[PDB]
Amino acid sequence: QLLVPPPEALSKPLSVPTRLLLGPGPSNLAPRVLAAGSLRMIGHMQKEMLQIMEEIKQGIQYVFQTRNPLTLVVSGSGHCAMETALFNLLEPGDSFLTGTNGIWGMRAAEIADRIGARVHQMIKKPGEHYTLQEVEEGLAQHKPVLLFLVHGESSTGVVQPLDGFGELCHRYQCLLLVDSVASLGGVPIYMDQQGIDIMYSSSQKVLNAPPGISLISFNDKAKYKVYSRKTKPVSFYTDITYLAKLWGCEGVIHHTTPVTSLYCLRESLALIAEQGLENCWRRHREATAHLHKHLQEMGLKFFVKDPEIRLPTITTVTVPAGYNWRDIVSYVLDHFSIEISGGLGPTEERVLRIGLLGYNATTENVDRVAEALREALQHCPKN
Amino acid sequence: MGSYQLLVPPPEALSKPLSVPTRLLLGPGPSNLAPRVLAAGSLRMIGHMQKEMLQIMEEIKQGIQYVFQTRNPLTLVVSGSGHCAMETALFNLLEPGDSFLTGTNGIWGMRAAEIADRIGARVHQMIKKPGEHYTLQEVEEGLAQHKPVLLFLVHGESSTGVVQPLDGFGELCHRYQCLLLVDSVASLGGVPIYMDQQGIDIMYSSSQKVLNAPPGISLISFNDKAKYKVYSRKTKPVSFYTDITYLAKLWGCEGETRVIHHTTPVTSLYCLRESLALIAEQGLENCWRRHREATAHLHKHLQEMGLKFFVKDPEIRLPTITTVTVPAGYNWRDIVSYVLDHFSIEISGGLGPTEERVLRIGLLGYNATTENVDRVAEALREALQHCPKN
Ligand SMILES: [Cl-]
Ligand SMILES: [Cl-]
Ligand SMILES: [Mg+2]
């Protein structure tokens, strides 16, 4: 007799319902990504896997708008690639500065504290962005080696302007690391042209691939910082000197990269390349304008008061006065099979979040969620 | 749409349809997938906090508890493939200055030693030649000498083709106030393991060896003694995202939930759930039997064609990954290429200390069959006939 018996719960067939995911992530998968999902396995070091890896690197270079050879995939979902960036870039005692205008800057600060950096934060209210003047004041005061700036603040629905920030940092002998998890593919970014030194994103937002892999790129200035270190990064597996070899970034090793995740990412990148970035950005702007018109018509208010900093991909809507937000979210799910979310970090209990991400950024999906919200407002209990 | 012109053009290579050839994967991993797991790869997405996902997470925990044979409530999934979960184990278990003991008999012990050095541990290694295992006497002498807080022991040494006996090691460690961490990445599902009954305090494995489950997630479990070491830390572990004191709350491992962001690789979980369902349906005993039978059959073929085992003692030969000494006069790359080119079968060379010294043949779950053994045996006999020899 075995200690632990076969779980009865596993004897039932796996079933996943069909829903429209209009929250902050994960997004619905595009047909090409769906098709990729049941492809057979091949060996990690085989000719065809090496070709798929090179095509993925080219695709990431295209979406990021970078020529950086140190551009690759790391395991992990959401914003966890910040750990890969920080573990490599920061040594104990290094001065680090964050744009803490939501949960992401705060999280970067927490990680940097854990590895022994001297952590400094420019704290702003949720719903605000950073000006060049504010960042220059932070650089002057703290003299950081690295600035962390969030492009798409998915906890607050904020899009951060990127022009001029990289060169401002360079004037202070500081590198610029950008988080574009919630913005990449939906908002204009030109990594090399904007002087961004390190950037990461995820597969599950605009890219419409399954969660679990992240995209990261380091320029040679950033690689120079890593090679100047007194000590090896705390993580062997996310050490850029190991990852670079694995991904053939220096003219290759043994490793277990996630094969099926690579097939899906390859297809997601192919779809963006075929549409072209300009069309992808226009499509998100167009979907968001239509959503913002419906929200205004329903009398719902925006959490972000300045229209110019509203993130096209994820909109923060102030919870309507008198309602329980959980009833609105549950009503939309039960009656329309649409997933929307509440808040995150500083916006917990304060907002609804609606995401219009890649394949889902259509005026048709906007009409579906607008209808669902209208019905929720007339039927959910009010005070 | 923005303030600059696009200067990196779309890659033309991405416009070609994505296809992959049909091959039999008999290397050290990944293995070919069972039809249910393949099918689970194309399932639709759902939200991370939704009722259906929470239920899948619950069934996965139960499934891991079953394959590990543990009642530990702190049993969950972490991101990362291969043996990466050793980082999650070591970042949580070791503080700067902690004495750490490793069974360095292949690449995995060397890897644990490196990671432990990176985090400021006082690292002590019991170095043995590739192809050997640790005796209870050897481990006791290491424990006595170094007084480690943690011993790292590799169950399935996939770089050398060695299976480590586990009976008595946990109990021995506890007499020296030491925790036992076991790596079962290459052995789980194919070799008998009884986590609680063998006194294993921490164990990890991954989903792409015997489990046949993409995309490459890790399974990990900590008992109460291991939890106590983690909560007694004077400093936070280096990773927030793999901090077990936060991940335990997320996964509902203590009754007191706090939805700290962390992660959920959804398609990953679907495939893992199905793989765990297949193993539970078949039963662990039958799974272990299938591996022994397939390996026995492979070993009989190898003996008959004159190939020599890298592991001298037959009882220490890992059923799931067999190491074969490269035969004298041949270029091992020619053998591996011949098997691929003429039979569409993937086998491998060595790893770490067995690089250039061995061939590796894996029989991992779904692929651990008689027909597959017969196929690789024919491919190997023909490679020995037709590859150039000195
Ligand atoms: Cl979907
Ligand atoms: Cl397959
Ligand atoms: Mg409309």
Pick the residue from chain A with its C-alpha nearest to B15: A270
- Nearest to residue A152, comparing CAs of A214, A116, A206, A232? A206
Both B119 and B88 in one domain: the answer is: yes
A49 and A112 inside one domain: yes
A353 annotated as belonging to a binding site for a ligand: yes
Distances A184 to A48, A152, A316, B137, B239 between C-alpha atoms, Å: 27, 8, 18, 57, 25
Contact B218, B242 (CB under 8 A): no
- The owner of tokens 């996902």 is B53
Residue B278 and residue B289 in one domain? no
Closest-approaching ligand to the CA atom of A370: 3
- Which amino acid is located at B268 in the chain? S
Decide if B49 contacts B260 (C-beta within 8 A).
no
In degrees rounded to 5, what are phi and psi of residue B143?
A: -60, -50
Can you tell me the distance from the alpha carbon of B118 to that of B96, in angstroms, rounded to the nearest whole number?
A: 9
- Do A169 and A299 have their domain in common? no
Looking up tokens 């995309």, which residue turns up? Answer: B215
First vs last C-alpha separation in chain B:
65
Residue A283 has φ and ψ, to the nearest 5°, of: -60, -45
* CB atoms A237 and B84 under 8 Å: yes
Quickly tell me which residue has 């309602």 as its tokens.
A323
d(CA A187, CA A283) in angstroms, rounded, equals: 10
To test the contact with chain A by mutation, choose from B240, B250, B260 the residue with the greatest count of A C-beta atoms within 10 A, namely B240
Which residue, B159, B114, B132, is CA-closest to B353? Answer: B159
DSSP state of A345: G
Side chain identity, residue B309: F
Quick one: tokens of B365? 């779950």
C-alpha A100: how far from chain center: 16
CB–CB of A314/A182 below 8 Å? Answer: yes
Binding residue ranges of B: 360
Distance (Å, rounded) from C-alpha A53 to C-alpha A266? 8
Three-state SS for A99?
Answer: strand
Cα–chain-centroid distance for residue B153?
13
Amino acid symbol at A35:
A
Method of determination used here: X-ray
Assign residue B8 a region (left: φ > 0; alpha: ψ between -120 and 50; beta: otherwise).
Answer: beta
Contacts of B7 in chain A (CB under 8 A): 65, 192-193
The Cα B8–Cα A193 span in angstroms is 11
CA dist A143 and A168 (Å) reads 12
Q: Nearest chain B Cα to A211, which residue?
A: B265
CA-based nearest residue to B167, from B145, B129, B207, B134: B134
* Sign of the C-alpha dihedral computed for residues B315, B318, B322 and B326 taken in this order: negative
Structure tokens at B88: 């999650």
Task: Name the helix (H) or strand (E) containing A71.
Answer: strand A70-75
Partner-chain contact B81 A27, CB within 8 Å: no
Contacts of B298 (CB under 8 A, 6+ apart): B322, B361, B363, B373, B376, B377
Residue A250's CB: how many other CB atoms inside 10 A? 11
Residue labelled with tokens 């603040």: A153
Residues A234 and A280 in one domain: no
Whether B321 contacts B160, CB under 8 Å: no
For residues B158 and B323, give the distance between their C-alpha atoms in angstroms, rounded to a whole number: 9
Asked, as a colleague might, if the bond just before B30 is cis with ω within 30 of 0, I would say yes
- Token readout for B245 is 């004191």
* Chain A neighbors of B119, CB-CB under 8 A: 234
- Which chain B residues are closer than 8 Å to A276 by Cβ? 10
How many angstroms separate the Cα of A242 from the Cα of each of A51, A84, A238?
Answer: 19, 12, 7
CA proximity to B327, closest of B357, B361, B296, B363: B357
Residue A103's SS3 state is helix
Say if residues A195 and A159 touch (Cβ distance below 8 Å).
no
Contacts of B54 (CB under 8 A, 6+ apart): none
Distances (CA, A) of A5 to B63, B182, B279, B285: 10, 22, 12, 12
Indicate whether A148 and A293 sit together in one domain: no
Final resolution, Å: 1.8
Of A21, A55, A211, the CB nearest to B264: A211
Q: Best mutation site among B20, B107, B340, B341 for testing chain A: the one with the most A CBs within 10 Å? A: B20
Instruction: Indicate which of A14, A180, A313, A325 best probes the interface with B, i.e. most B CBs within 10 Å of its own CB.
Output: A14
Helix axes B51-68, B266-282, angle to 10 degrees: 50
Q: Is residue B18 domain-shared with residue B129, that is, in the same domain?
A: no
CB contact set of B315 (below 8 Å; sequence gap of 6+) = none
- Residue A30 tokens read as 């595009």
Return all residues near A51 (Cβ < 8 A) that are at least 6 apart.
Answer: none
**Ligand 2: distance of its center to the CA of B189 in Å?**
18
Instruction: Verify whether the Cβ–Cβ distance B14 to A263 is below 8 Å.
Output: no
Residue A208 and residue B96: Cα distance in Å, rounded?
41
C-alpha torsion A225→A226→A230→A235, nearest 10? 150
**Do B151 and B178 touch, CB atoms closer than 8 A?**
yes
**What's the longest Cα–Cα distance across chain A?**
70
Are A27 and A208 in contact, with CB atoms under 8 Å apart? yes
Q: Please check whether residues B325 and B241 belong to one and the same domain.
A: no
Task: Give the separation between CA B118 and CA A126, rounded to whole angstroms.
Answer: 37
Q: Tell me, letter by letter, the H, E, C secondary structure of chain B.
A: CCCCCCCCCCCHHHHCCCCCCCCEECCCCCCCCCHHHHHHCCCCCCCCCCHHHHHHHHHHHHHHHHHHCCCCCEEEEEECCCCCHHHHHHHHHCCCCCEEEEEECCHHHHHHHHHHHHCCCEEEEEECCCCCCCCHHHHHHHHHHHCCCEEEEECEECCCCEECCCCCHHHHHHHCCCEEEEECCCCCCCCCCCCCCCCCCEEEEECCCCCCCCCCEEEEEECHHHHHHHHCCCCCCCCCCCCHHHHHHHCCCCCCCCCCCCCCCHHHHHHHHHHHHHHHHHCHHHHHHHHHHHHHHHHHHHHHCCCCECCCCHHHECCCEEEEECCCCCCHHHHHHHHHHHHCEECECCCHHHCCCEEEEECCHHHCCHHHHHHHHHHHHHHHHHCCCC
Shared-domain flag, residues A232 and A193: yes
How far A128 CA lies from chain B's nearest CA (Å)? 21
What's the rounded Cα separation, in Å, for the pair B191 and B318? 8
**Cβ atoms of residues A86 and A216 within 8 Å:** no
Which among A54, A114, A194 is the nearest to B236, CB-wise?
A: A114
Structural tokens at position B18 = 């994505």
Helices (H), chain A: 31-36, 47-64, 81-89, 103-114, 132-142, 165-171, 220-227, 240-246, 259-275, 277-297, 325-336, 363-379
Ligand closest to the CA atom of residue B214 = 2
Chain B contact set for A237 (CB, 8 A): 80, 84, 87
- Going from the Cα of A61 to the center of ligand 1, the distance in angstroms, rounded, reads 26
> Are β-strands A146-150 and A175-179 bridged in parallel, bridged antiparallel, or unpaired?
parallel
Q: Which chain A residues are within 8 Å of B81, Cβ to Cβ?
A: 75, 256-258
- Ligand 1 center–CA A18 separation, angstroms: 8
Report the C-alpha gap between B154 and B163 in whole angstroms.
Answer: 8
Rounded distance between C-alpha atoms, residue A260 and residue A251, angstroms = 25
Domain containing B146 — which CATH number?
Answer: 3.40.640.10
Instruction: Tell which of A275, A296, A319 closes a domain.
Output: A275
Count of domains for chain A: 2
How far is the centre of ligand 2, averaged over its atoms, from the C-alpha of A254 (Å)?
20
Whole-angstrom distance, CA of residue A45 vs CA of residue A47: 7
Q: Cα–Cα distance between A26 and B238 in angstroms, integer?
A: 27
Last residue of a domain, one of A242, A258, A275: A275
State the CATH number of the domain containing residue A367: 3.90.1150.10
Between CA A75 and CA A63 the distance in angstroms is 19
Interface size, chain A vs chain B, as Cβ–Cβ contacts under 8 Å = 289
Residues of A within 8 A of B47 (CB-CB) are: 19, 21, 23, 26, 339, 341
Binding site members of B for substrate: 360
Contacts of B142 (CB under 8 A, 6+ apart): B101, B124, B126, B148, B151
Tell the residue number behind the tokens 């916006």, with chain if given.
A347
Q: How buried is A266 (Cβ within 10 angstroms: 0-12 exposed, 13-18 middle, 19+ buried)?
A: buried
Longest Cα–Cα distance in chain B: 70
Torsional sign, CA A21, A26, A32, A38: negative
Say if residue A371 is in the same domain as residue A269. Answer: no
SS3 label, residue A304: coil
What is the C-alpha separation between A188 and A161, in angstroms, rounded? 10
CA dist A77 and A118 (Å) reads 27
Adjacency order of strands within the sheet including A118-123: A70-75, A213-218, A198-202, A175-179, A146-150, A95-100, A118-123
Single out the residue in B237, B267, B282 at which a domain terminates.
B282
Phi and psi (nearest 5°) for A67?
-105, 5
Q: How many CA atoms lie within 13 A of B233 on its CB side?
A: 19
Q: Which of B241, B281, B286 to mutate to test the interface with A (most CBs of A within 10 A)?
A: B241
Tell me the residue type at A195: G
Contacts of B18 in chain A (CB under 8 A): 36, 39, 52, 263, 266-267, 270
Of A17, A37, A77, the CB nearest to B42: A37
Do residue A208 and residue A346 come from a single domain?
no
Torsion-angle region of residue A167: left (phi > 0), alpha (psi -120 to 50) or beta?
alpha
Domain ranges, residue B6: 1-33+283-390
Q: State how far the alpha carbon of A215 is from the alpha carbons of A200, B207, B278, in Å.
A: 5, 22, 33
How many Å apart are CA B120 and CA B97, to the nearest integer? 6
Determine the residue of chain A that is closest to B66 in CA distance: A4
- Ligand 2 centroid to B34 CA: how many Å? 7
Q: Which two tokens stand for residue A201?
A: 């994103």
How do beta strands A198-202 and A175-179 pair? parallel
Residue A157 CA, chain-centre distance (Å), reads 12
Q: Measured between beta carbons, which residues in chain B are less than 8 angstroms from residue A48?
A: 20-21
B83: tokens are 């043996």
Which amino acid is residue A216, in one-letter code?
I
The reply to whether A224 and A312 lie within a common domain is no
- Contacts of range A30-35, beta carbons closer than 8 Å, 24 or more positions apart: A30/A208, A30/A267, A30/A268, A30/A271, A30/A358, A30/A359, A32/A267, A32/A268, A32/A270, A32/A271, A33/A208, A33/A209, A33/A210, A33/A264, A33/A267, A33/A268, A33/A271, A34/B42, A34/B44, A35/A267, A35/B42
What end-to-end distance do the CA atoms of chain A give, in Å? Answer: 59
